[PDB]
């Protein structure tokens, strides 16, 4: 990414190979680079334990005449992440239809063997994966751009909580400031 602002946009195209992957990421709100510096990850980085559900909101920022459908699925922890839409659809997922309402939400339920999870997540306290796939594809009429973008928003539900106040590792100094 030669341009930093490009990090916030997920590319999309018109003639996509059927059932292609849009994006994939690990669900480590306090450790993964994706969620590390977000408004939520920053708060979690001051703590050691966390629990509760999370919200992921996606907004389509294409043309008004564009249309399409997308499948967004959450895969609980396992030995292998999904590789295809058939594998992905077995877990929790929602079918998103783009229309007048430009945004859809995907509540990631709290499914875990322990009441709490470590911010410095490991194999024992893994949380799973989240992926998005083309459901029908994007179709546009004549005289419109051939590409579009999507944005994602992250926030915590009303059952979220944290514990064990600790010092964040993102900030450090070598000499006294003057």
């Amino acid at each position: 990414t030669t341009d930093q602002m490009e990090m916030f946009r997920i590319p999309v195209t018109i003639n996509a190979p059927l059932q292609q992957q849009v994006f994939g990421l690990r669900l480590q709100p306090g450790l993964d680079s994706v969620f590390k510096h977000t408004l939520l990850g920053e708060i979690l980085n001051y703590y050691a334990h966390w629990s509760g559900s999370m919200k992921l909101t996606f907004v389509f920022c294409g043309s008004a005449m564009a249309t399409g459908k997308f499948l967004i699925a959450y895969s609980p922890p396992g030995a292998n992440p999904p590789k295809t839409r058939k594998d992905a659809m077995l877990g929790t997922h929602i079918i998103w239809d783009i229309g007048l309402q430009s945004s859809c939400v995907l509540c990631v339920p709290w499914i875990s063997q322990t009441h709490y999870r470590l911010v410095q997540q490991d194999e024992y306290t893994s949380a799973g994966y989240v992926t998005c796939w083309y459901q029908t594809g994007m179709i546009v009429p004549p005289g419109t751009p051939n590409s579009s973008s999507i944005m994602c928003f992250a926030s915590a539900c009303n059952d979220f909580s944290v514990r064990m106040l600790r010092d964040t590792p993102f900030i450090s100094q070598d000499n006294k400031l003057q």
Binding site: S51, T57, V105, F160, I171, L177
Partner: protein, 278 residues
């Protein structure tokens, strides 16, 4: 009656079954600036769960209710340079990065303060170290703005008649003390987007509102035949805290103690591609 007798768990999860209706909680519009209030019960079947988790440890009082070092300096009992035998620190909370960032998450703060002082001494190296010295004693002086400032260790200003002071002897517990809310305004300001002069000139930023005074420290009367060096650490612990207007945490490393100057930094780290998850 010689006694006066003076908890809020997170929300529970309600059971939800299959649904098929025109109501669509999932779809919303972020353009309104409104954060969706959906819950997992609104998009999938869920069991009834009684949740006893509480957000007690996430309150601002507990978050800021921890003592943190804000300054350290060294001073010698005896030396040729007069300025090197005592310390003079203008009070400010921007010196140390951890506490600076913790405080800078809010625009305005209002709290009482609890100050603790940790003092340690060590004998400087030399060719001849054999000596006997009784226990040392230290004096901490606080000078509100505009008061007289000592120019040497044995200055007359050290005879405080109105300025509060603490005398401490090595080997005992660290000194501790309380300070009320002493701001001329209704709340402390971590940021100030303005100038000092009315014609938009002069000093700029939070440096304009820093008028808390000074702190001075010295050895009361200790003067060893050989030099001895002492170090003092100051710890602040807000109490009875209130905060307003939260702001995003800082991302770039600090570079100045009285300015917001910074160097551009990448948003976050990179990975092989958008699909890499391993």
């Amino acid at each position: 009656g010689d006694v006066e007798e003076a908890v809020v768990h997170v929300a529970d999860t309600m059971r939800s079954g299959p649904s098929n209706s025109a109501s669509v909680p999932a779809l919303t519009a972020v353009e309104t600036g409104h954060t969706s209030q959906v819950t997992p019960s609104d998009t999938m079947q869920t069991r009834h769960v009684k949740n006893y988790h509480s957000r007690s440890e996430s309150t601002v009082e507990n978050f800021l209710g921890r003592s943190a070092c804000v300054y350290m300096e060294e001073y010698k009992t005896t030396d040729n340079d007069v300025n090197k035998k005592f310390v003079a620190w203008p009070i400010n909370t921007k010196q140390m990065v951890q506490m600076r960032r913790k405080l800078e998450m809010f625009t305005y703060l209002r709290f009482d303060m609890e100050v603790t002082f940790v003092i340690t001494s060590r004998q400087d190296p030399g060719t001849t170290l054999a000596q006997d010295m009784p226990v040392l004693t230290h004096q901490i002086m606080y000078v509100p703005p505009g008061g007289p400032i000592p120019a040497k260790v044995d200055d007359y200003a050290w005879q405080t008649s109105t300025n509060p002071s603490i005398f401490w002897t090595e080997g005992n517990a660290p000194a501790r003390m309380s300070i009320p809310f002493i701001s001329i305004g209704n709340a402390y300001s971590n940021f100030y987007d303005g100038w000092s002069n009315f014609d938009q000139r002069g000093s700029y930023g939070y440096n304009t509102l820093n008028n808390l005074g000074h702190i001075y420290v010295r050895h009361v009367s200790g003067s060893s035949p050989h030099p001895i060096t002492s170090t003092i650490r100051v710890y602040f612990k807000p109490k009875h805290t209130r905060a307003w207007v939260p702001r995003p945490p800082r991302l770039c490393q600090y570079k100045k103690a009285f300015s917001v100057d910074f160097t551009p930094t990448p948003i976050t780290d990179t990975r092989k591609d958008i699909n890499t998850v391993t």
